[PDB]
Design a protein around this nucleic acid. Structure first.
Ligand code: DCP
Ligand code: DCP
Ligand code: CL
Ligand code: CL
Ligand code: CL
Ligand code: CL
Ligand code: CL
Ligand code: MN
Ligand code: MN
Ligand code: MN
Ligand code: MN
Ligand code: MN
Ligand code: MN
Ligand code: NA
Ligand code: NA
Length: 326
DNA sequence: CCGACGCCGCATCAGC
DNA sequence: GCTGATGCGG
DNA sequence: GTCGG
């Protein structure tokens, strides 16, 4: 964390552009800068040194010189003082409340935790649970807990059908010592790109995990994606573990490698890797890598038998999960 | 200068 | 009910 | 906000 100050500043500026400005390319540009800088192995001494890094331009170079000189950025100190931006920024911390709803709420005079609690009736279901577990979701998860959760999820899934396979991805799979939540990839022989030979596949699982009281709430749910909440069982007399976010994603067993690549991330690594795909004339999603015809129209799925195969196509050497934390 | 900027599932709305 | 646009978070 | 072209 050589340049933690700079990257925090950029992160806050990113958050501002997303939540208040609703300027999603500014959001992403700052996030990119922040990530590149974050990986850089020297304590930055100037804007010009930063500006040697792809993603950092003049505007960010200026901001970094202002920061390294004073320890602050006047532009941030301002936004912090703006009640509206401050309120929009806070409200967006609730899962389900984006920039739009946030601006909505602040417009009706809803702009604090207390205001939200007294107005549950004005929140959709997702927003309701985000609020319910607000504090809980702020907490991080130590790996040792992720290892316990992993154990419960996996064995409960074997109890449903021995042919289910479940791979924990996200930061956990990247070897992080703490995760902000749990991401589960789920595959079953009876579900491939060529057929859905069984319905309920995901439901069957969410139910088992509900039966055993692991999963406690649901934010959203369709045939292949479940978004909700879970909680480790706590021993006799011990205070309960916090409530955690969980995501479960069912994908075609034959498309696992693109899936496992996708859900491992990081989000920024995926944006970076996919953009270099377009530059190299391919397109990648959670299901396939496919070539881009002269027109820009995608072609048929290329054969993939490994995470490595995917890197090959777009001429990148293989990067371990642990080295994908961007 | 210019246009592009990763790509997708589910919830909710508008319009028919 | 459907279908598409939009929000929201992955 | 940045960068390839
Ligand atoms: N949720 C999962 C997880 C794994 N597999 C599969 C496809 C693979 O070919 C294989 C791999 O076994 P591993 O558990 O060791 O997972 P890896 O993908 O890392 O191994 P490999 O790259 O050798 O396939 O089992 C699957 O179908 N669904
Ligand atoms: N804009 C995004 C956000 C997320 N993801 C992906 C890659 C991620 O790694 C995964 C999980 O999303 P998370 O928000 O859970 O991110 P992480 O697991 O990487 O981090 P955290 O430790 O906070 O959970 O899905 C993505 O493709 N694009
Ligand atoms: Cl923008
Ligand atoms: Cl500051
Ligand atoms: Cl796993
Ligand atoms: Cl596809
Ligand atoms: Cl690794
Ligand atoms: Mn995660
Ligand atoms: Mn998170
Ligand atoms: Mn997640
Ligand atoms: Mn709780
Ligand atoms: Mn571009
Ligand atoms: Mn240029
Ligand atoms: Na640069
Ligand atoms: Na939010």
């Amino acid at each position: 964390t050589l340049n933690g100050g700079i990257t925090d500043m950029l992160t806050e500026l990113a958050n501002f552009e997303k939540n208040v400005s609703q300027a999603i390319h500014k959001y992403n540009a700052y996030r990119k800068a922040a990530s590149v800088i974050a990986k850089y192995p020297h304590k930055i001494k100037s804007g010009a040194e930063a500006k040697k890094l792809p993603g950092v331009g003049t505007k960010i170079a200026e901001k970094i010189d202002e920061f390294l000189a004073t320890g602050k950025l006047r532009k941030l100190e301002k936004i912090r003082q703006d009640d509206t931006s401050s309120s929009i920024n806070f409200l967006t911390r609730v899962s389900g409340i984006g920039p739009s709803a946030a601006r909505k709420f602040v417009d009706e005079g809803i702009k604090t935790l207390e205001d939200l609690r007294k107005n549950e009736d004005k929140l959709n279901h997702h927003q309701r649970i985000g609020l319910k577990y607000f504090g809980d979701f702020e907490k991080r998860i130590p790996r040792e807990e992720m290892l316990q959760m992993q154990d419960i999820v996996l064995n409960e899934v074997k109890k449903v059908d021995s042919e289910y396979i479940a791979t924990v991805c996200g930061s956990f799979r990247r070897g992080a010592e703490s995760s902000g939540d749990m991401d589960v990839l789920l595959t079953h022989p009876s579900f491939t790109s060529e057929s859905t030979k069984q319905p309920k596949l995901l439901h069957q699982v969410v139910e088992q995990l509900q039966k055993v009281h692991f999963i406690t709430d649901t934010l959203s749910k369709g045939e292949t994606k479940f978004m909700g909440v879970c909680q480790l069982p706590s021993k006799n007399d011990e205070k309960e573990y916090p409530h955690r976010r969980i995501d479960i994603r069912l994908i075609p067993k034959d498309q696992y490698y693109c899936g496992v690549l996708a859900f491992t991330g990081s989000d920024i690594f995926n944006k970076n890797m996919r953009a270099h795909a377009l530059e190299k004339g391919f397109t990648i999603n959670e299901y396939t890598i496919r070539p881009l015809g002269v027109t820009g129209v995608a072609g048929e799925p290329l054969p993939v038998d490994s995470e490595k195969d995917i890197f090959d196509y777009i001429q990148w050497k293989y990067r371990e999960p642990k080295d994908r934390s961007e």
